[PDB]
Amino acid sequence: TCPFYKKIPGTGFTVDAFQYGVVEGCTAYFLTHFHSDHYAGLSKHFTFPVYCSEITGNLLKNKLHVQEQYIHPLPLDTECIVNGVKVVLLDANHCPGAVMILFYLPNGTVILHTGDFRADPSMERSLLADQKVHMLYLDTTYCSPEYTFPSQQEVIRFAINTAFEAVTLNPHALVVCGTYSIGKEKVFLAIADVLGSKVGMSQEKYKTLQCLNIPEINSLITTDMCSSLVHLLPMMQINFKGLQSHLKKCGGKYNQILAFRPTGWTHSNKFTRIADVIPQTKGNISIYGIPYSEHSSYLEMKRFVQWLKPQKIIPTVNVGTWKSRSTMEKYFREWKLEAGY
C-alpha cells in the first residue's frame, strides 16, 4: 500500500506515488522528476491530473505517451493554486526538470518535499528564505558521514583535461560515456565541447535529450555515430567485453577507447582525491569511474537542514530497514542540538 511518506496531510495530494493504482482520496498526483523509481506505474492509460515541471511534462508526453489533457505543467518560482491549495515548484539541482515542492496548508502549516536533490547554498536565497517550514520530506540517499564527494565543477574539470590530453596524444582514440537515465548530461557535453565534436547516440536517447530545453541543443548532439568521436552507450555496455565489441562496430576508424562511468558514491571516495583517480585498463581500453553526484553529500545535506530548521523531518530514502531509520534519526538529533532549534 502507499507509504505514509508519499502522502501530504491536510490535502488530497500524493508525491511520486504512481505504482499503487488508485490511491483512495487522491485528487492530484505530483511527480518530482523523470526517474523510473519515481514515475513507476505511469503510462498512456493514466486518467488523473499530474502536476510537474515543463520538462518532466515533455518527457511524460513524448516518452511515456501520457495524454496531454492529464499533464499539468507549472512554472518554477511562482505561487500557483492547485485544488484550492497554494504550491510553489523550486529547482532541486538533481536532473533536468527535477523540482522540490512547497505546500502551504489551509491550517497554516508549510511543508517542503525535496524530491531528489543536491543541496546547495543557492537554495538559501530562493523563495524558501521568505517563511518558516514546519515539516521536511527529505532525500536522505547519502545521510552518513562517510559520504564525501567533490564538487560537480571539480569532476568536470578532471574529465575535460583527461579526455583532451588522451585524444591529442592519439587522434584515433574514441571517447565513450555511459548513461541509463536522464541526468549528468554535463559529463558528455563538456567532453564533446573540448574535443569539437557533437555527441553521438541512439535514436531513443536523442529523442529523450530533445525534451530537456537545453539551449542550442541542435548544435551539440547527433544520431550520426560516424561523424562523432564522443559516443553514448547504455551503462550496461561500459565494460571490456561491451567496449571491445563496440570498437569492432566502428570499422577500424579507432584503435583505442577511453570510457567514463559516472557513478554515485563508491568506497574509493573515503581514501582518494579527484586529482589521484586511475582507470581500469585491458589492452587498448581504459574505464574511468568518476564520482559525479546529483544527490547531496552528508555535509551539504546537514548545512541545508541546519539552515532551514524544520520542526519535523520525514526521510524518503533508505526507509526500509530499522537500522537505517535509527541511524538517520540520530543524525537529525545531533544536528538539531548543535544548531539549537
DSSP code string of 121-185: GGGGGSGGGGS---EEEE--TT-STT-----HHHHHHHHHHHHHHHHHH-TTEEEEEEESSS--H
Stretch that binds Ni ion, among 29-37, 76-84, 302-310, 311-319 (CB under 5 A): 29-37
Minimum distance from CB of 226 to Ni ion (Å)? 33
Residues 88-117 that bind Ni ion (CB under 5 A): 116
Minimum distance from CB of 103 to Ni ion (Å)? 20
Q: Strand 85-91's sheet: what is its strand order? A: 80-82, 85-91, 99-104, 110-113, 135-138, 312-315
Q: For 174, phi and psi rounded to 5 degrees?
A: -105, 140
Question: For residues 294 and 308, which CB has a smaller minimum distance to Ni ion in the complex?
Answer: 294
Question: For residues 93 and 286, which CB has a smaller minimum distance to Ni ion in the complex?
Answer: 93
Give me Rg for the CA atoms of the chain.
22
Near Ni ion by CB under 5 A: residue from 6, 30, 31, 35: 35
Site size toward Ni ion (CB under 5 A) is 2
Stretch that binds Ni ion, among 28-36, 222-230, 260-268, 321-329 (CB under 5 A): 28-36
Best CA proximity match to 97, nearest among 89, 105, 85, 106 = 89
Minimum distance from CB of 115 to Ni ion (Å)? 8
Angle (deg, nearest 10), helices 322-339 and 298-308 = 50
Residue 302 · residue 335 · CB < 8 Å: yes
Question: For residues 6 and 35, which CB has a smaller minimum distance to Ni ion in the complex?
Answer: 35
Question: For residues 41 and 106, which CB has a smaller minimum distance to Ni ion in the complex?
Answer: 41
Going residue by residue from 114 to 133, which x/- string records binding to Ni ion, judged by CB under 5 A?
Answer: --x-----------------
Which parts of this chain interact with Ni ion (CB under 5 A)? 35, 116
